[PDB]
């Protein structure tokens, strides 16, 4: 058969990071992906989404200054932005292929299961390897209710030839809200059906409520405390059944979307046939991101049950660590800096570090600064109605435990709270800092 | 009075409000409405107007790529929008001053009303241009008060305001000229970066005239003819309005400084480490009015305020300390800098590593269809910390502050590389720049 130094399942951010890193320290590298090389982020995730959001920002901005110095609000041309998006998606796989060829990396284009501890079924073949890496990331949750198969994926949303006239999103996290915001701004009826009491349960609700507000003003119907129990095909539309505490509601839309959590993409690998430990949260890893059982097996990114948030940069960070323990031997212990996250709605919400309740749960002595500040210059000049913050400061050290933002540019500003946390910067050293002005960053000293 | 303050600017307001809260008697005077250059005739009103232009600019980068129509700026309606900001501010300063037992006065020897300690916070004024016809040239405040936009505009200058205003006017549909005396525009800034703003500014339909001294302005009908001499010719330039964009001397030359023995230069009131005058020790200065190590920025005016306020309140216990002072040119694309230029870090004999790159191909420049994206970082080799960073492209006005925090925190290069940033964002390009 073929022996390999490293064999990697999936050429995503974690797969690319290890493949490139190991191949340039001389090792023989075999990588396989069932889909074109790139990963969820580059082809069907963050990048394509952010491109699309581009044109909506133009529309949103023109709308905000209407009759305040702008007369015509542009309508988004759905056709042209998909093509623009596509030029980014189409270029990335050949770009990762070009690099794999220039690095002595064997490209395989087939799915992968374990046959044994150190062997894999790649199409027909039977590739053994010295160290094997699981970097499969996560997949859409299979909806286990009558009609579940009618619910299109996130990938399908980003590949729409035409924008449907109405869209329902089954979910209550970041994807449901980002895709609702895009759909509505491009001129469709949108509904969001979420099973929980609170949308974006993970985020500080004193921030989330302002996003719910903006989301209603946009013409997006938020349905809470509802389990979808069916999807039926009524002509070329869909009739969605939802059950709440007593009553039953039906909802019609030209397209229904699966916006649920994403389980780790590890359940079809025949893990058990290789003695590899796993949970419902993904591949079980130790402090070296080495499997807790089979020590030839490493995992990184969404496919690993780590303390890492399911974020592109985390997948890279975990990538550098796995590749290091492979190339040199188990020396490096994974260390997480702050993990800032963004919901790419307009207005954006951003969060880094602990929530109020999380910091109390950990018995930290805290100070809380929450403030709605829509009347601050930065919100008023851009005519953005929702601007609010919540900062969590440790009373003992006078450092930041966490920051939670909604308003203009929070996706950027959240990174200054990230750096303040990582550098253990005292609250008074941020207050007396000089920022460029007028800028959103320059409001940070007023948030403390 | 305990404290008497000349000018309710950012420095004036800061010292006034700070002293008044500790139980001191406070007297302040301006001459114009209370607020200062930034709030009423500077940064604030300028940023409001730039908003409308960002819409037009953005709806045009994505022209044919998801946007079909490019909106025209309504000069009247954004003036009105700008004016609502400016008009509501001075009554808001009264409400603060009155709610703290501060005496408001609205008029222009050693300590002559007399008071125990006196503060000079007069800020800066437009340079009086002293050539035949200099008076025709309107102030930058007048640009921000224009009822109507002229059809052509000429800017005498090579600094941030000349370019910021040229960008606005061009985007609003006007033929625009910059006449600069110097060899290079924006001389203080890294030229490896400035050259990219030059490129974009010409692509905008702006004529940049270099190495030219303006010798006259002549007013024929509702036009003006500007005369300009180089090493060769005396080229002439015609425009419905000419603007004074030349540099702002400190606003102290008409206060009769010599009548109080108070040290000054042409660069402003001479101050010590306490921001107390090097001669008269009853006199403190803050802002554009002080010849301090502080750049002429709003936040510097505030920082200098809090030091003067503290030395006055408890006695001379605090020596002014400057953090990194990031500055921005609010053109599109924006230009940003903080800390040392390459040549300045060499002048202080730092052993330096320099990272430059033009990166208009990177995802963040490419997805926004911004052609100009470049950076230049200056790293001290010994400590592996950032001495300076210099940026042009999308969001540099926001991103430059991360370089500021990195410098203040003596953050090692490798810890910026290992940081996790929100993605996709402009901030997440920082570790690639390093
Ligand atoms: C719509 C969407 C938007 C997102 N937006 C953001 C955002 O803005 N910011 C952010 O930080 N994160 C975002 N994320 C998350 C981000 O995409 C992931 O955290 C990151 O891409 C995980 O990368 P990975 O390397 O772990 O997996 P991926 O990068 O997805 O790579 C896994 C690869 O494995 C392949 N594969 C899977 N199973 C097998 C198998 N059995 N055999 C062979 N190949 C297999 C897949 O085809 C895929 O190419 C988003 C995700 C989605 C879905
Ligand atoms: C067009 C422009 C754009 C700018 N943009 C920016 C920017 O984007 N970012 C930034 O950080 N900085 C910017 N600045 C700089 C900023 O305006 C100043 O640094 C800031 O105003 C400093 O405040 P100050 O207290 O020193 O002066 P000011 O607040 O300007 O001065 C206070 C007041 O003193 C008054 N005064 C003058 N003489 C007398 C007198 N004899 N008696 C009584 N009162 C008097 C004046 O009327 C003035 O209103 C800009 C400046 C201009 C002109």
Residue numbers in the entry:
A (entry chain A): 1 to 448
B (entry chain B): 4 to 111, 116 to 119, 127 to 448
Give excerpts from the publication:
In this study, we identified and characterized mercuric reductase (GbsMerA), which is coded as a component of the mercury resistance (mer) operon in G. salicanalis isolated from Antarctic soil. We characterized GbsMerA, a mercury reductase belonging to the mercury-resistant operon of Gelidibacter salicanalis PAMC21136, and found its maximum activity of 474.7 µmol/min/mg in reducing Hg+2. As seen in the structures of thioredoxin reductase (high Mr), trypanothione reductase, glutathione reductase, glutathione amide reductase, and dihydrolipoamide dehydrogenase, the overall structure of GbsMerA also comprises an FAD-binding domain (residues 1–146), an NADPH-binding domain (residues 147–275), an interface domain (residues 276–340), and a dimerization domain (residues 341–447)29. GbsMerA has two pathways that connect molecular surfaces to the si- and re-faces of the isoalloxazine ring in FAD.
Crystals of GbsMerA (35 mg·mL−1) were obtained in drops of a 1:1 mixture of protein and crystallization buffer (1.6 M sodium phosphate monobasic/0.4 M potassium phosphate dibasic, 0.1 M sodium phosphate dibasic/citric acid [pH 4.2]). After interactive refinement of the coordinate, the structure was refined with a Rwork of 20.2% and a Rfree of 24.2% at 2.6Å. Two GbsMerA monomers, forming a homodimer with two-fold symmetry, were found in the asymmetric unit. Whole residues of the two monomers in the asymmetric unit could be built, except for regions 112–115 and 120–126 of chain B because of the unclear electron density. Non-covalently bound FAD is located in the central region of the FAD-binding domain, with two hydrophobic interactions, 16 hydrogen bonds, two water bridges, and π-stacking interactions. An unambiguous redox-active disulfide bond between Cys41 and Cys46 was found in the opposite NADPH-binding domain. In the si-face channel, two cysteines (Cys41 and Cys46) from the CXXXXC motif form a disulfide bond, and Asp47, Thr312, and Tyr437´ from the neighboring chain surround the disulfide bond and seem to be involved in the transfer of Hg2+ or the reduction of disulfide-bonded substrates. However, this His–Glu pair is substituted by Tyr437´ and Ser442´ in the corresponding region in the GbsMerA structure. The relative activity showed that Y437F completely lost its activity, indicating that the hydroxyl group of Tyr437 is important for metal coordination during transfer. Without NADPH, the side chain of Tyr174 points to the isoalloxazine ring of FAD by forming T-shaped configuration.
